[PDB]
Amino acid sequence: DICFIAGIGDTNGYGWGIAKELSKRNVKIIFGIWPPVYNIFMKNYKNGKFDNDMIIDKDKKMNILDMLPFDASFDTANDIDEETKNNKRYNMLQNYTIEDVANLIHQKYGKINMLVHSLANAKEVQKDLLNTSRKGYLDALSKSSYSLISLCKYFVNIMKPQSSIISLTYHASQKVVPGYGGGMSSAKAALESDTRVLAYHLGRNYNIRINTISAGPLKSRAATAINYTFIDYAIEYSEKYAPLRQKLLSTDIGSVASFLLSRESRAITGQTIYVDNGLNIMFLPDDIYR
Amino acid sequence: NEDICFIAGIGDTNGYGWGIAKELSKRNVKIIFGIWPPVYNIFMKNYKNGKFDNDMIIDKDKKMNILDMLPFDASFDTANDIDEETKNNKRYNMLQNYTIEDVANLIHQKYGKINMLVHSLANAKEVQKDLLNTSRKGYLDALSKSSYSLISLCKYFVNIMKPQSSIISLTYHASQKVVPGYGGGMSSAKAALESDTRVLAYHLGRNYNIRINTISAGPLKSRAATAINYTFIDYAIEYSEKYAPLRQKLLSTDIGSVASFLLSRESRAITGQTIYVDNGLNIMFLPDDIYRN
Amino acid sequence: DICFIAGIGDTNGYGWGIAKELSKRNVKIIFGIWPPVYNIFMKNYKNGKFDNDMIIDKDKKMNILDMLPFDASFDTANDIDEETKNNKRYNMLQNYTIEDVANLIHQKYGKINMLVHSLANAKEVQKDLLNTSRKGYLDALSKSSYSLISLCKYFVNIMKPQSSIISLTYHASQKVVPGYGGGMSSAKAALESDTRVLAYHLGRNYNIRINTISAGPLKSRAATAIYTFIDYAIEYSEKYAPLRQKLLSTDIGSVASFLLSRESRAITGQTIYVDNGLNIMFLPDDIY
Amino acid sequence: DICFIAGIGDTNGYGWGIAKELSKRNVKIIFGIWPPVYNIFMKNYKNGKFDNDMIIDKDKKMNILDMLPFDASFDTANDIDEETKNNKRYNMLQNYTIEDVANLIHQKYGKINMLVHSLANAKEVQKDLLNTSRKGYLDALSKSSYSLISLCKYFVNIMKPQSSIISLTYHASQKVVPGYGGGMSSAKAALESDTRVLAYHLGRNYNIRINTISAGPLKSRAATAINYTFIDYAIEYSEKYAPLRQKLLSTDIGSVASFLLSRESRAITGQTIYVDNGLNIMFLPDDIYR
Ligand SMILES: NC(=O)c1ccc[n+]([C@@H]2O[C@H](COP(=O)([O-])OP(=O)(O)OC[C@H]3O[C@@H](n4cnc5c(N)ncnc54)[C@H](O)[C@@H]3O)[C@@H](O)[C@H]2O)c1
Ligand SMILES: NC(=O)c1ccc[n+]([C@@H]2O[C@H](COP(=O)([O-])OP(=O)(O)OC[C@H]3O[C@@H](n4cnc5c(N)ncnc54)[C@H](O)[C@@H]3O)[C@@H](O)[C@H]2O)c1
Ligand SMILES: NC(=O)c1ccc[n+]([C@@H]2O[C@H](COP(=O)([O-])OP(=O)(O)OC[C@H]3O[C@@H](n4cnc5c(N)ncnc54)[C@H](O)[C@@H]3O)[C@@H](O)[C@H]2O)c1
Ligand SMILES: NC(=O)c1ccc[n+]([C@@H]2O[C@H](COP(=O)([O-])OP(=O)(O)OC[C@H]3O[C@@H](n4cnc5c(N)ncnc54)[C@H](O)[C@@H]3O)[C@@H](O)[C@H]2O)c1
Ligand SMILES: Oc1cc(Cl)ccc1Oc1ccc(Cl)cc1Cl
Ligand SMILES: Oc1cc(Cl)ccc1Oc1ccc(Cl)cc1Cl
Ligand SMILES: Oc1cc(Cl)ccc1Oc1ccc(Cl)cc1Cl
Ligand SMILES: Oc1cc(Cl)ccc1Oc1ccc(Cl)cc1Cl
Ligand SMILES: [Cl-]
Ligand SMILES: [Cl-]
Ligand SMILES: [Cl-]
Ligand SMILES: [Cl-]
């Protein structure tokens, strides 16, 4: 049981919660870390900054097999642009394209069992969809949607039959969340549809499964960066109006992904699964209702 | 405390209830069967003749463990709802406490409060009839037995369940897309069960911190399935094994594994949901003939 | 073109709005009027109380072909219960069952081509779903959902091919609306599913189309009989729907009239939202 | 009432069917024609090759207000690349960018009432999703999805009160259609999501409505160019298994588009309306049951 988790930058996101929960099941875990934060992550980890965040309970802490620099906007080394080659954080680093990381993992560890796509990006997220530029829009689809397909395409050859693949989405794909701008809504819409199409292909040709988890709000780094703030309203609305009022943890999403990545979920594929305390089911805020 | 599950809708070892039972016991969850009185005795005779002994094996070193088996009719909420004919029925008279209220109270006396509840049952007298030609009594019977029964079970079991408890039912994709042959208001009853799962999840969540979901299952050759009007169930299985993204035979235990996950605390942020456990066949639009190789 | 419109009690509901819009397209309209309110309706009509409400524009007035008593609880006269036999409001009336009304319409005007189901009922609507009784839930399904099926079964043989059928639903079927109790949510969910299954059977065997309009909130008599629920619903919708305009009964009538016509002949089994776009929204807008 | 129809390259598509049904309600019609096929269209039209296809009934025939070159690849003139600029079919054409045509329509005809998006393109449609390149994918999203956004953005300030917008999508967005490759599934998924997001911003800022029609299969030039071929299979299945067994015509979609573009439909926005003889509602083939 080896899982590659792409899209860990710190201990505050969904990627860390998935790591944690899978570690609970003695899955070996490999982090794919975006190069602009790689060296920072590695320093904090080496200086024990996350040690407390690695604790599960009395007698298991997390065990991280490897941490690799990983940029899912580049499929192969030939795709790396000149702007990126001329960026100091990327220059120390090698083998950070989807193809390169897949080759490295395979040669180093052999075939793996699970894959987590826990990343997204969009230059113009601050702009509403109507005022998003073409370049901004396509950047969102490239980083947040296409990335999954290419990840699947390069990883299928290094995954065993009956492996499982997970991505994270948001309900803004399906119902309007003002503030979820820059084509991110569009990108999550595509990702949930592509999950179906990929499940057909991965199912039939590889007996590999793929699903997506539509998560509720978490104050991760990426979330707080959208412009108190958007995420703060989102959390507070969720905790007020969700069927289950308890605070939503990265690790609640971690448990469901760990189930979807295991053979326990073997008759589930191509699905969007809501791990959001049931908020998605509500139509009207509850205020007046006695 | 400790995990105890009531599974309403076990009439033999060939249905989803038994798969859920088997997967729950795998996880050392205590399990009580709710068995429809018309088939209660036949079930109890086979269980003691050892006829389920082989179906009860989990593996070389594990066997299922059944805490209790009770007569249960989800047609009746209380004793006073029991009609004249059923009273005169000899399959029912030597059996007591089989109304929804009664079985809850009985379970709560013998064992105290439970953690888990599975609704694994449906009935519809005119299932063989198309929806357009299904009578009012036919339609209301389907809704009564397959949809309202879940609501009543919830209502009565809510006060004998611990907080953080979980509830599941089973549904079929016929609710959302047209399956001819799924007659007699069964389609309508699953549509309602899926809608009711959401509304119940709101009320159960806010007031008791209890979760409820439904599993939309692919085809299984259960006793009931073979009672639908080749036969319906054989085409469904054959079609699904041919056209689903995943070609494996769908097993009751595949539903049971997912059920046990939804019933456990690993799914604590999931509620009100319809979860597809059907090898991904729901995601397909057209048959795959021209395209495949 | 002749349309039977089941579920008119007054000018303030969706049925009247549909009637108004159909009459705009020269469709002849037959009202199915629930017996409790039949007398009152015919009295008010006779004394000219609906005369302003019948004007479409200054060159066109609604024309109403007939007004027939109608209770969708009863498939045949054999189904009428003792309580109803003790109701004077019914004892003075005839041919109000689904079977009888279809026969009467067919005997009187021949085959028709449009049918509108604009009705619902549930005795325990004030009770949340969890504390709704079996009798109450089944009542909601019987009156609000099964009634569509039976209306279809009885009208199919007095309808021409290329006919069209419409009912009204609410988004409580698909997303939680607290206060929409009694199993009304369950009934709308069943109606939307049955709309698909009926579309298949009616499509292949009769070349007949059937769809459901999911309407936004309107301050009808039945709505008010449920802040109050309906004023909350309306305020929220007007606060948050993509479109600010007040939702009018005739905005539904306009879509119903399109769906009932040949212009929508490639559309069947569909739930069409006519609600100022409210259904698309996730979160309140305020801070944004 | 004036409608601009983006995506008519011949009389065999849904664009033509919409133009026909709108002309039937005396709407004035402007075509946005892709420059690569603009000349041949103008030749064919000028020679009478479309006269029979312009016949509506006994006494009415289509009346076209204008026919303009138009490429939804380019938002403004500054976006046009040098290869395109030198291409023979572009270098005598002008004002064919999204912004330029909007401004041309405006000064030529004043403000308009209706806008139809009836285009799609994807350079790698013959490749299944998993095997689609990043560039192909983004090209599908750029031409088939982002273009709607850009059309909206440049047109809103040239639209009259009570204006309405439609585009055309396909059910492969929601359920798997093998063969609908190249990220077209993805693009249609984006389009349907974006239709909701646009409906919100357009409704609240401009009281403008936008919907999408999910059409059944039509033997158009674009459909034939995909691939039993893909389209012949799709039509055969639709005609055998739809609740309504009848040939699906471009005017069937035209009729719905006309409605949605009109004031009869003013309480409808952000929706995906299925015009497919009810095929979308079916689960499995019908063979056994009958
Ligand atoms: N946080 C929430 O409230 C929430 C809700 C719904 C969905 N999601 C989704 O969960 C996933 C993770 O988000 P999160 O909140 O955990 O954010 P996060 O900041 O913790 O993780 C996002 C990660 O993406 C990485 N990344 C960005 N661009 C990349 C690129 N081009 N190549 C490789 N990596 C890149 C960043 O380094 C970062 O570590 C995303 O898909 C997000 O859209 C989050
Ligand atoms: N078999 C399938 O392919 C399939 C597919 C989708 C959903 N489901 C659902 O799974 C659930 C169980 O079906 P199954 O396939 O295991 O068949 P099954 O024959 O094993 O289960 C049906 C059970 O319902 C019980 N029952 C019927 N009426 C009852 C009543 N009034 N009161 C109490 N019990 C009653 C019977 O004892 C019977 O054992 C049902 O809800 C069904 O709709 C089954
Ligand atoms: N008003 C709204 O906000 C709204 C919103 C969404 C959906 N709807 C739906 O639209 C339809 C019409 O409702 P409305 O709000 O216009 O209310 P309404 O009060 O105008 O119409 C309800 C009618 O149903 C009739 N009725 C009740 N029981 C009947 C029976 N057994 N047989 C025949 N008629 C019977 C009543 O006489 C009444 O005239 C209903 O299905 C309702 O659920 C209404
Ligand atoms: N034909 C079907 O069975 C079907 C089914 C569902 C949806 N649709 C959708 O309907 C719409 C119309 O398709 P159609 O089948 O009528 O095919 P079509 O060949 O008539 O339409 C495509 C048109 O778009 C033009 N075009 C392509 N790229 C362009 C761009 N760069 N800028 C401007 N114009 C461009 C082409 O010249 C062509 O005329 C598309 O969005 C399509 O996806 C079609
Ligand atoms: O998808 C999300 C949804 C929410 Cl409610 C919060 C954070 C999310 O994640 C992102 C949002 C925008 C960008 Cl640009 C990148 C990421 Cl990771
Ligand atoms: O729901 C089901 C779906 C399938 Cl594919 C097969 C069997 C099913 O179960 C039933 C079907 C009809 C009746 Cl009357 C009772 C039951 Cl338990
Ligand atoms: O469905 C409805 C939805 C809304 Cl928002 C308002 C009124 C509605 O109509 C009804 C609601 C309950 C009952 Cl018992 C009967 C009817 Cl006619
Ligand atoms: O969307 C469509 C759906 C179908 Cl069934 C047939 C044709 C369609 O339209 C297209 C499909 C692919 C490309 Cl590249 C361009 C276009 Cl216009
Ligand atoms: Cl936005
Ligand atoms: Cl049926
Ligand atoms: Cl309620
Ligand atoms: Cl594909």
CSV table of C-alpha atoms in Angstrom, one decimal, chain C residues 52-230:
chain,number,residue,atom,x,y,z
C,52,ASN,CA,-60.9,42.1,-14.1
C,53,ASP,CA,-58.8,39.0,-13.6
C,54,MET,CA,-60.1,37.5,-16.9
C,55,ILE,CA,-58.8,40.4,-19.0
C,56,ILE,CA,-55.6,39.5,-20.9
C,57,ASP,CA,-55.3,42.8,-22.7
C,58,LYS,CA,-57.7,45.5,-23.9
C,59,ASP,CA,-58.6,43.5,-27.0
C,60,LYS,CA,-58.7,40.0,-25.5
C,61,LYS,CA,-60.7,38.4,-22.6
C,62,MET,CA,-60.3,34.9,-21.2
C,63,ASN,CA,-62.9,32.5,-22.4
C,64,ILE,CA,-63.8,29.5,-20.2
C,65,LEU,CA,-65.4,26.6,-22.0
C,66,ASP,CA,-66.7,24.8,-18.8
C,67,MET,CA,-66.3,24.6,-15.1
C,68,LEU,CA,-66.6,21.1,-13.6
C,69,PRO,CA,-66.4,19.8,-10.1
C,70,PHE,CA,-63.4,17.5,-9.6
C,71,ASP,CA,-61.8,15.6,-6.7
C,72,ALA,CA,-58.5,13.8,-7.5
C,73,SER,CA,-58.9,11.6,-4.3
C,74,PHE,CA,-61.4,9.5,-6.2
C,75,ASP,CA,-60.6,7.3,-9.2
C,76,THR,CA,-64.2,6.1,-9.6
C,77,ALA,CA,-67.6,6.7,-7.8
C,78,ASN,CA,-67.1,3.4,-6.0
C,79,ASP,CA,-64.1,5.0,-4.3
C,80,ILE,CA,-66.1,7.7,-2.5
C,81,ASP,CA,-66.1,7.3,1.3
C,82,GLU,CA,-68.8,7.8,3.9
C,83,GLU,CA,-67.4,11.1,5.1
C,84,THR,CA,-67.8,12.5,1.6
C,85,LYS,CA,-71.3,11.0,1.3
C,86,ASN,CA,-72.1,13.1,4.4
C,87,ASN,CA,-70.8,16.3,2.8
C,88,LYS,CA,-73.6,18.5,1.2
C,89,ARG,CA,-70.9,20.2,-0.8
C,90,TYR,CA,-70.5,16.9,-2.7
C,91,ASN,CA,-74.1,15.5,-2.4
C,92,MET,CA,-75.4,18.2,-4.7
C,93,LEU,CA,-72.7,17.5,-7.3
C,94,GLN,CA,-72.0,14.8,-9.9
C,95,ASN,CA,-69.3,13.3,-12.0
C,96,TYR,CA,-66.4,14.7,-10.0
C,97,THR,CA,-64.3,11.5,-9.9
C,98,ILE,CA,-61.3,11.1,-12.2
C,99,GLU,CA,-63.1,8.5,-14.3
C,100,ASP,CA,-66.4,10.4,-14.4
C,101,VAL,CA,-64.9,13.8,-15.3
C,102,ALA,CA,-62.9,12.3,-18.3
C,103,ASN,CA,-66.1,10.5,-19.6
C,104,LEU,CA,-68.1,13.7,-19.2
C,105,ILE,CA,-65.5,15.9,-20.9
C,106,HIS,CA,-65.2,13.3,-23.8
C,107,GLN,CA,-69.0,12.9,-24.1
C,108,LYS,CA,-69.4,16.7,-24.1
C,109,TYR,CA,-66.5,18.0,-26.2
C,110,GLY,CA,-64.8,14.9,-27.7
C,111,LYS,CA,-61.0,14.4,-27.5
C,112,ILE,CA,-58.8,17.1,-26.1
C,113,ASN,CA,-55.0,17.7,-26.3
C,114,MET,CA,-53.8,19.3,-23.1
C,115,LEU,CA,-54.0,18.4,-19.5
C,116,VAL,CA,-52.7,20.4,-16.5
C,117,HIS,CA,-52.3,18.9,-13.0
C,118,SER,CA,-52.1,22.0,-10.8
C,119,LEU,CA,-53.0,20.5,-7.4
C,120,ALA,CA,-51.6,19.1,-4.2
C,121,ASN,CA,-52.9,18.3,-0.7
C,122,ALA,CA,-51.5,16.8,2.5
C,123,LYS,CA,-53.3,16.8,5.9
C,124,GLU,CA,-50.2,17.0,8.1
C,125,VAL,CA,-48.2,19.6,6.0
C,126,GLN,CA,-47.6,21.5,9.3
C,127,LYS,CA,-45.7,18.6,10.8
C,128,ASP,CA,-42.1,18.0,9.9
C,129,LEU,CA,-41.5,14.7,7.9
C,130,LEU,CA,-40.1,12.8,10.9
C,131,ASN,CA,-43.3,13.3,12.9
C,132,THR,CA,-45.6,12.7,10.0
C,133,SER,CA,-48.1,9.8,10.3
C,134,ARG,CA,-48.4,6.9,7.8
C,135,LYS,CA,-52.0,8.0,7.1
C,136,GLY,CA,-50.7,11.6,6.6
C,137,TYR,CA,-47.8,10.7,4.3
C,138,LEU,CA,-49.9,8.4,2.2
C,139,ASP,CA,-52.5,11.1,2.0
C,140,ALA,CA,-49.9,13.5,0.6
C,141,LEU,CA,-48.8,10.9,-2.0
C,142,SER,CA,-52.3,10.0,-2.9
C,143,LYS,CA,-53.6,13.5,-3.5
C,144,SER,CA,-50.4,15.1,-4.7
C,145,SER,CA,-48.6,12.3,-6.7
C,146,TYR,CA,-50.8,9.3,-7.5
C,147,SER,CA,-53.5,11.7,-8.8
C,148,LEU,CA,-51.2,12.6,-11.7
C,149,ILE,CA,-50.9,8.9,-12.6
C,150,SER,CA,-54.6,8.3,-12.4
C,151,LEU,CA,-55.4,11.4,-14.3
C,152,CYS,CA,-53.0,10.2,-17.0
C,153,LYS,CA,-54.5,6.7,-17.1
C,154,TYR,CA,-58.1,8.0,-17.5
C,155,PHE,CA,-57.3,10.9,-20.0
C,156,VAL,CA,-55.1,9.0,-22.3
C,157,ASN,CA,-58.0,7.5,-24.2
C,158,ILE,CA,-59.8,10.8,-24.6
C,159,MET,CA,-56.6,12.6,-25.7
C,160,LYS,CA,-55.3,12.9,-29.3
C,161,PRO,CA,-51.8,11.9,-30.2
C,162,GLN,CA,-49.2,14.6,-30.0
C,163,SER,CA,-50.9,15.6,-26.7
C,164,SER,CA,-49.0,17.1,-23.8
C,165,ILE,CA,-49.4,17.0,-20.0
C,166,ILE,CA,-48.0,19.2,-17.3
C,167,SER,CA,-47.9,19.1,-13.5
C,168,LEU,CA,-46.4,21.5,-10.9
C,169,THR,CA,-43.7,20.6,-8.4
C,170,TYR,CA,-41.4,22.2,-5.9
C,171,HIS,CA,-37.6,22.0,-5.4
C,172,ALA,CA,-38.2,20.7,-1.8
C,173,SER,CA,-38.1,17.3,-3.7
C,174,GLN,CA,-34.4,17.8,-4.4
C,175,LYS,CA,-33.2,20.1,-1.6
C,176,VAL,CA,-34.3,20.5,2.0
C,177,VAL,CA,-37.0,23.1,2.7
C,178,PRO,CA,-37.9,23.0,6.4
C,179,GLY,CA,-41.6,23.7,6.8
C,180,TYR,CA,-42.6,21.8,3.7
C,181,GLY,CA,-43.8,19.0,5.9
C,182,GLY,CA,-46.4,16.2,5.8
C,183,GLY,CA,-44.6,14.2,3.1
C,184,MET,CA,-45.2,17.0,0.6
C,185,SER,CA,-41.4,16.9,-0.2
C,186,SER,CA,-41.7,13.1,-0.7
C,187,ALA,CA,-44.8,13.6,-2.9
C,188,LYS,CA,-43.0,16.1,-5.2
C,189,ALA,CA,-40.0,13.8,-5.4
C,190,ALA,CA,-42.3,11.0,-6.4
C,191,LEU,CA,-44.1,13.2,-8.9
C,192,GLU,CA,-40.8,14.3,-10.6
C,193,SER,CA,-39.7,10.6,-10.9
C,194,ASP,CA,-43.2,9.4,-12.1
C,195,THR,CA,-43.1,12.2,-14.7
C,196,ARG,CA,-40.1,10.4,-16.3
C,197,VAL,CA,-41.6,6.9,-16.0
C,198,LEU,CA,-45.0,8.2,-17.4
C,199,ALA,CA,-43.1,10.0,-20.2
C,200,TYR,CA,-41.7,6.7,-21.3
C,201,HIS,CA,-45.1,4.8,-21.3
C,202,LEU,CA,-47.1,7.7,-22.7
C,203,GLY,CA,-44.3,8.5,-25.3
C,204,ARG,CA,-44.1,5.0,-26.8
C,205,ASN,CA,-47.7,3.9,-26.6
C,206,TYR,CA,-49.5,7.1,-27.2
C,207,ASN,CA,-47.0,9.6,-28.6
C,208,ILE,CA,-47.9,11.8,-25.6
C,209,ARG,CA,-45.5,14.1,-23.8
C,210,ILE,CA,-45.4,14.9,-20.1
C,211,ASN,CA,-43.3,17.3,-18.1
C,212,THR,CA,-43.3,19.0,-14.7
C,213,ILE,CA,-42.7,22.7,-13.9
C,214,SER,CA,-40.8,23.4,-10.7
C,215,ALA,CA,-42.2,26.7,-9.7
C,216,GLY,CA,-40.8,29.4,-7.4
C,217,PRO,CA,-42.9,30.7,-4.5
C,218,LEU,CA,-46.3,32.4,-5.1
C,219,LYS,CA,-48.8,33.7,-2.6
C,220,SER,CA,-51.7,31.4,-3.4
C,221,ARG,CA,-54.5,30.3,-1.0
C,222,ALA,CA,-52.8,26.9,-0.5
C,223,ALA,CA,-49.4,28.5,0.1
C,224,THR,CA,-50.8,30.8,2.8
C,225,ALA,CA,-52.6,27.8,4.4
C,226,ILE,CA,-49.2,26.2,5.2
C,227,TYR,CA,-42.6,35.3,9.3
C,228,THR,CA,-45.0,32.8,7.6
C,229,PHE,CA,-43.6,30.0,5.4
C,230,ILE,CA,-44.7,31.6,2.1
